[PDB]
């Protein structure tokens, strides 16, 4: 039953990786929803839409990289349903950015817990995988989203549609 | 409530489009599963894996194009859960190709039903959208998968692992 | 006696590094033996020979990088005999690949033990050296060798000399 | 009061980062002093001066990268006075190199203590930041300075002004 | 004790040059603080941050040019502590620009006093050094900062965060 | 048992070739040891280190060429342990060069004995192989090392560390 390649790879780590794969796919789905919310004719923020579509694709890349890891270590991928996002209507550029920030912080928390498990199971390869490919990426993403939220709020989002328009143009464009 | 852009776009068409979006996302997820099945160290058919990963990305593109359509017509996207694929282990290159063929024929059937609904609701834009972007794509995909299955079977798949190896090399490589 | 550069570098780490240097040189010698086994006129698998020669040179590079590390930290290199490989005749492409997989897993195990020692001695530089340059390299190498073994077995190695021939051509060529 | 981006970032880590920022700025100031010591008409070792000026700028870069980290994690930078270097007159190329070696080892020790704190606070992002950008840089710098000191001493520095001249020309030039 | 190169270089001029070196280093430190204030996630004015970082580096260049002068004339550099800036939090783009203007005017005043001393000591080389490299630079810098402050105030800074955003984009970007 | 390619290839020649393979691998190991001796922070002669590393790689090439010969003639390679070098610490550039000269002369002597055996066994192919690829290479290497030793001694090695420094720079650099 044991993969010929498997070495120092705990069942708990394999399961946590599968959970992280699902979470990354969920994040991709959330960002896709946000993108096409901004593509609506009654919202019409093209650069918001583009930004979130980019994020969706990036999240899919993260999921695929975790799947690759899983196979590299000799674990077995078990996929689960990708839950629909919490909202169909994201209300505003500012609200979408805040929800994105919350999502990214949740993903970061799950990654940190994964790192903690890896450390406890003395899996330095897994630890450094997480460190190299995920943790700094998350920190950067959270910082960027926080900057976006800060700017939007100072500009007067979400009540200032001019604010969101100009943010779309000058920051995201 | 009615979108300022909406014209000649029936609620039934909007709902059917949302269903097709979900089906395309499901197909993408299935192909992703198949790809990483072939990336396993105990399967190790790199070109099968690449082929199905390409298919996964193509299906994602199809879903995104349907979402774009939905917004173009003034319908509203409602996402649902993306169900996990029917299998974690796809058993063989031949079996994966046969399951892909079945999936593609199911997608084609749903597209045909969508076209029929569009026709009944006198939505020529929707009809020609389906015709231009989806129906021929499906016909080609089904023909290609059928060719693959035919070749594999004649080569001796799935019992001939040499067969699958050489197919991976010479057709998919 | 203490090197002017030495800082936070435990004697146990220095000794373990010297052992790892020897192990890498041993692995380079094993791969050299395998290469020239496949260069024999009665074996004549040129791409197997090339693959293992490449592996031999890579292992030499790994040893030299460990020696460089040793000097960087202010430890002192102590070389030992490089033991001859376990076999003169590696019997088959499949058997050589399986022995290579076993060797790589042994090297990986020694690296993991080195990492564990580094961690206990609170040597984060050494830990990250191992993580960056060795652990992922090992994981990749083990995965690749496992893929090779899987393919060969499915093709019918080692009884199918046609199998090994075609593997030599299409995978390693 | 808590930054919207802050996650898994302990107050003790924030304070230690601020201390490291100050230490890096101090090191920059020390190297600047050494550079312009060698620019004196009664010392006149242009390549020593250039080497230390380069080191000063590198140390400034290190400080700025720590400040960037601080903001990325949602900590707050608190600057302190940059103390003047211990010497105005560094006496010789050899003495300056030895003082530089001592400084680099002190910076390395502070970084190691920072890593230890990060580890205890389960901050893998901070740990890997330190590992990636600082620890190996320090090891290299210490090794290089040790090489310089060794060469100078063997050449006959600091009593052999010919020694220092030729070192300036052939190593640092 | 007297440098072989020293000619027509008064002790008072040497001391004043050392004071100016310290002041330039202080200005560099102030601008660095301002830059990283604007890099905060709760401020997030990237082009303000870039502008002040540029100013910091320019001030360092000015200090280094004064040190070079000091050695050229045969004076001896004596470094002092670089005091921390007056603020950790610069409150706003407008407030930072006003503080920068005040700092630049203080630096200009010190340069003018240096020129006056040089003139009194009949040091035409020192006078023309100051004139060529510093005084016009200061005049330009003060004019630019005044323009920035004027624009920000007219736009509605610091109460209009939209004002500061658009200034960051269109003037500093 | 006899190789299909074997012709005019005596068992004594095959055994002598295996011995020469081992000797070349030993020489490679010796040069590697010397290289990393010179890479030590307390020796720090980078160009000595580079020179001996080059020699190590050249010796490995010589061994591989002998292994290729062995297979070409239909002999069978039998590897033995590679003994550790006689020293961990080579004391000086001059001493290392003298030991290298001694090693090269020993290798040359073994090659000459191999040639003598080949001649007695009327193996003109083997004779001309040795002549073409090895004997002149050895003569050149011995001459070069003798030149190095001569220069170092005249410069004042090993007591003149300035001597070794300048040799490292001007001859080996
Ligand atoms: Mg049509
Ligand atoms: Mg074929
Ligand atoms: Mg790490
Ligand atoms: Mg001849
Ligand atoms: Na992610
Ligand atoms: Na499709
Ligand atoms: Na290795
Ligand atoms: Na530093
Ligand atoms: Na200035
Ligand atoms: Na040789």
Curated annotation (Swiss-Prot), chains A, B, C, D, E, F:
UniProt entry tagged with the keyword Oxidoreductase: yes
Result when mutating residue 24 to A: Reduces iron binding and oxidation rate
Gene Ontology cellular-component terms listed: autolysosome; autophagosome; cytoplasm; cytosol; extracellular exosome; extracellular region; ferritin complex; ficolin-1-rich granule lumen
Enzyme Commission number: 1.16.3.1
Residues the entry annotates as binding Fe cation 1: 24, 59, 62
Catalysed conversion reaction: 4 Fe(2+) + O2 + 4 H(+) = 4 Fe(3+) + 2 H2O
Tissue: Expressed in the liver.
Disease: Hemochromatosis 5: A disorder of iron metabolism characterized by iron overload. Excess iron is deposited in a variety of organs leading to their failure, and resulting in serious illnesses including cirrhosis, hepatomas, diabetes, cardiomyopathy, arthritis, and hypogonadotropic hypogonadism. Severe effects of the disease usually do not appear until after decades of progressive iron loading. Neurodegeneration with brain iron accumulation 9: An autosomal dominant neurodegenerative disorder associated with iron accumulation, primarily in the basal ganglia. It is characterized by global developmental delay apparent from infancy, and progressive decline of motor and cognitive skills. Clinical features include delayed walking or inability to walk, spasticity with hyperreflexia, ataxia, dystonia, and poor or absent language.
Record-given protein name: Ferritin heavy chain
Native source species: Homo sapiens
């Amino acid at each position: 039953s044991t993969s010929q390649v498997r070495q120092n790879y705990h069942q708990d780590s394999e399961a946590a990786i599968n959970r992280q794969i699902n979470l990354e796919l969920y994040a991709s789905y959330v960002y896709l929803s946000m993108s096409y919310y901004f593509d609506r004719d009654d919202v019409a923020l093209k650069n918001f839409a583009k930004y979130f579509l980019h994020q969706s694709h990036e999240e899919r890349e993260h999921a695929e990289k975790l799947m690759k890891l899983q196979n590299q270590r000799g674990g077995r991928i078990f996929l689960q349903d990708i839950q629909k996002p919490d909202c169909d209507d994201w209300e505003s550029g500012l609200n979408a950015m805040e929800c994105a920030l919350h999502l990214e912080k949740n993903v970061n928390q799950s990654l940190l817990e994964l790192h903690k498990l890896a450390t406890d199971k003395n899996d330095p390869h897994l630890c450094d995988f997480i460190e190299t490919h995920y943790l700094n990426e998350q920190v950067k993403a959270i910082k960027e989203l926080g900057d976006h939220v800060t700017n939007l709020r100072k500009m007067g989002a979400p009540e200032s549609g001019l604010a969101e328009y100009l943010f779309d143009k000058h920051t995201l464009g």
